[PDB]
Amino acid sequence: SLTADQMVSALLDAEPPILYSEYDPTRPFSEASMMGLLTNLADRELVHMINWAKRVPGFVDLTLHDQVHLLECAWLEILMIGLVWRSMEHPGKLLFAPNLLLDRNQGKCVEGMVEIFDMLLATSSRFRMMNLQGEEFVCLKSIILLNSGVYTFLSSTLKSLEEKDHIHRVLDKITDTLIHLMAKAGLTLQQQHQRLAQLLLILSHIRHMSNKGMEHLYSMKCKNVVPLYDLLLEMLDAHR
């Protein structure tokens, strides 16, 4: 129902805030102290994401069981692309919070984690190279919410999404919205399909990062490294 510019303004209006971490954590970072700060932040961000998802145009039209399936499928992708976005203007650093600017070497405090640090930093380095605009970013974040669970059969449920036809209709609108934004940037027709392709190809790498980060967080819970808050626990448990 909304126009292309109405689509962008609505997505910009629903943007979640940038939360903070603890103002005086353990000064020498440890494996448990690091994972505690990250899981505490993610659990607080998840509450703001649920309210943001309800404002994504077309999300409220789905049934309740279709709404949950899309959120358990893409909650880590959305949190990761949000971190990559605010880490754009910080080369070699990840802006987890304004008071938690972590570098690549500091990611080695958690075992098997720097591999994901490098993948997130490479994603941020590419957005910087293509000069990603904020209107393009909110578009890609909404694509992740609607597309990451359309064909996905979660192991904890063995079922997928029902309203397939409705999701692809909204996804076509965001595709037009993306192309519309590339035109306002003065890009040519050829430059439009190429940039649209490069943007959606990074969504594959973000999907890969979420699966690698999901297995890592599961091992951290099984190793008693960090307790998981009930909401973050339920989001992770939806994949096992």
Binding site: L71, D230, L231
Partner: peptide, 8 residues
């Protein structure tokens, strides 16, 4: 069923 509740 926390996300199940916060959506409603």
């Amino acid at each position: 069923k926390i996300l199940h509740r916060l959506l409603q």
